[PDB]
């Protein structure tokens, strides 16, 4: 078991040029593959989740080239739905963005493809998306547990009236939205009840528009999509820096700055996680907004009690930043933390207690009361990049922290620790 030990960080200050957004990267790659023309993506993220999407596109016959640092990609669009037969197996690691998006997209036409991944992915739900795709005509078989990957896709999605449950993942709706335009018939997608992670739907619509397709959004309750459309290459497209990856560095300044500036995202970003900066401001930090940067400067840090359904990923960063805040912090309406890389409510509560906090693990919330002083712990990371990145913040105290399996950060941010070190100062 590999591990890394972080020594106490006296102060953080500096500038980080962010790695590309995983959310934007995977949507842009799939749309580029489906589109007509050559798309050149710049600032693309090089991480496991994007690599699995790239490998899937390669297996499906899509041609592309990558720059030396794998952040520039020139994709030759397929000019329509992707195809493969012979039950071609696509291994997608634990990349939900690739699993959910491809599960829908590959239902267009005829195909015979199997989507699978790492053991944890076979435990992450996909039944709501499968139910919706079937209502639209798709033939999908669960090869192991009902409602979970692996899936055998045999095509047939033609459109029509499709209901989709939006209470567990917004990715199911995203996948349907990206797929429906290329179906032969028009599709009316109706959301059954609640919709979680709503801001990611805006990312999806933004990318679709970039690639030439718009739909009718009726207050996020129903979406009307015209079929028979085609995606078109936007030419050169700049992938925004990752706002979720930015959270650690902005939080580090809120705790131990100094001023930390992240570049690649700014006030105009489409990512909902830029709203993480607003939470730091509510806790007492100072935030500055630019066209291509967001910066945070240390002020004070007070506990907050907030519904975090709009920023589920970056919200994990508040759970460890809470160790440094005055008072008890409560993060609410985050049930789906339980169905992601690991059950994050169980994992976060378990590891936070190890450094001294008193924690109430609610069914869909977490309440954190910090200790007077943190203690050393060897942190388990549950094959979850964010557990490693969130707990790295423990080193902004007087105690070192040991992080198990630090390479798990590669799911979205291979160079995380070197970037944290870049802004770590001894004086
Ligand atoms: O659509 C996307 O790019 C994502 C949506 C979110 O998932 P849920 O909608 O399941 O919360 C988020 O947690 C994931 O990292 C990326
Ligand atoms: O990035 C995260 O914090 C959670 N990602 C879930 P996925 O992208 O695998 O569906």
From Swiss-Prot:
Optimum pH is between 6 and 6.5. SUPFAM superfamilies: EPT/RTPC-like. CDD domains: EPT-like. Pfam families: EPSP_synthase (PF00275). 3-phosphoshikimate binds at residues 22-23, 27, 169-171, 197, 313, 336, 340. The record marks 408, 411 as: Modified by bromopyruvate. Competitively inhibited by glyphosate. Inhibited by (S)- and (R)-phosphonates analogs of the tetrahedral reaction intermediate. Inhibited by (R)-difluoromethyl analogs of the tetrahedral reaction intermediate. Inhibited by bromopyruvate. One of its GO terms (cellular component) is cytosol. It is found in: Cytoplasm. This is 3-phosphoshikimate 1-carboxyvinyltransferase. PANTHER family: AROM/DEHYDROQUINATE SYNTHASE (PTHR21090), PENTAFUNCTIONAL AROM POLYPEPTIDE (PTHR21090:SF5). The active site is at residue 313. Catalyzes the transfer of the enolpyruvyl moiety of phosphoenolpyruvate (PEP) to the 5-hydroxyl of shikimate-3-phosphate (S3P) to produce enolpyruvyl shikimate-3-phosphate and inorganic phosphate. The gene is aroA. One of its GO terms (molecular function) is 3-phosphoshikimate 1-carboxyvinyltransferase activity. Phosphoenolpyruvate binds at residues 22, 96, 124, 171, 344, 386, 411. It catalyses: 3-phosphoshikimate + phosphoenolpyruvate = 5-O-(1-carboxyvinyl)-3-phosphoshikimate + phosphate. Its EC number is 2.5.1.19. Monomer. Belongs to the EPSP synthase family. Pathway: Metabolic intermediate biosynthesis; chorismate biosynthesis; chorismate from D-erythrose 4-phosphate and phosphoenolpyruvate: step 6/7. GO terms for biological process: amino acid biosynthetic process; aromatic amino acid family biosynthetic process; chorismate biosynthetic process. The keyword Transferase applies. The keyword Transmembrane helix does not apply. Keywords: Amino-acid biosynthesis, Aromatic amino acid biosynthesis, Cytoplasm, Transferase.
């Amino acid at each position: 078991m590999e591990s890394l030990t972080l020594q106490p960080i006296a102060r953080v200050d500096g500038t980080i040029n962010l790695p590309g957004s995983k959310s934007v990267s995977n949507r842009a790659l799939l749309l580029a593959a489906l589109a007509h023309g050559k798309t050149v993506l710049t600032n693309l993220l090089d991480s496991d989740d994007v690599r699995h999407m790239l490998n899937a596109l390669t297996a499906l016959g899509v041609s592309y080239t990558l720059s030396a640092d794998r952040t520039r990609c020139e994709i030759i669009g397929n000019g329509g739905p992707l195809h493969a037969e012979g039950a071609l197996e696509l291994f997608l690691g634990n990349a939900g963005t690739a699993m959910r998006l491809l599960a829908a997209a590959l239902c267009l036409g005829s195909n015979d493809i199997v989507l699978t991944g790492e053991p944890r992915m076979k435990e992450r739900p996909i039944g709501h998306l499968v139910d919706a795709l079937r209502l639209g005509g798709a033939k999908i078989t669960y090869l192991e547990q009902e409602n979970y990957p692996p899936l055998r896709l045999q095509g047939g999605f033609t459109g029509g009236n499709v209901d989709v449950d939006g209470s567990v993942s917004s990715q199911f709706l995203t996948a349907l939205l990206m797929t429906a335009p290329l179906a032969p018939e028009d599709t009316v997608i109706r959301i059954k009840g609640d919709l979680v992670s709503k801001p990611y739907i805006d990312i999806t619509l933004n990318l679709m528009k970039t690639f030439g397709v718009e739909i009718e959004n009726q207050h996020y309750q129903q979406f009307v999509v015209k079929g028979g459309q085609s995606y078109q290459s936007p030419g050169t497209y700049l992938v925004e820096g990752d706002a979720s990856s930015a959270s650690y560095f902005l939080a580090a300044a809120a705790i131990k700055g100094g001023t930390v500036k992240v570049t690649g995202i700014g006030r105009n970003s489409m990512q909902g996680d830029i709203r993480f900066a607003d939470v730091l401001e509510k806790m007492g930090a100072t935030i500055c907004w630019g066209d291509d940067y967001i910066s945070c400067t240390r002020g004070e840090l007070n506990a907050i009690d907030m519904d975090m359904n709009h920023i589920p990923d970056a919200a994990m960063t508040i759970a460890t930043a809470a160790l440094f805040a005055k008072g008890t912090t409560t993060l609410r309406n985050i049930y789906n933390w339980r169905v992601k890389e690991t059950d994050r409510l169980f994992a976060m509560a378990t590891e936070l207690r190890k450094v001294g906090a008193e924690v109430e693990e609610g069914h869909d919330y977490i309440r954190i009361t910090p200790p007077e002083k943190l203690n050393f712990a060897e942190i388990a990371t549950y094959n979850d990049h964010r557990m490693a990145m969130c707990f790295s913040l423990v080193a902004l105290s007087d105690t070192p922290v040991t992080i198990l399996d630090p390479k798990c950060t590669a799911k979205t941010f291979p160079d995380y620790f070197e970037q944290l070190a870049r802004i770590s100062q001894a004086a």
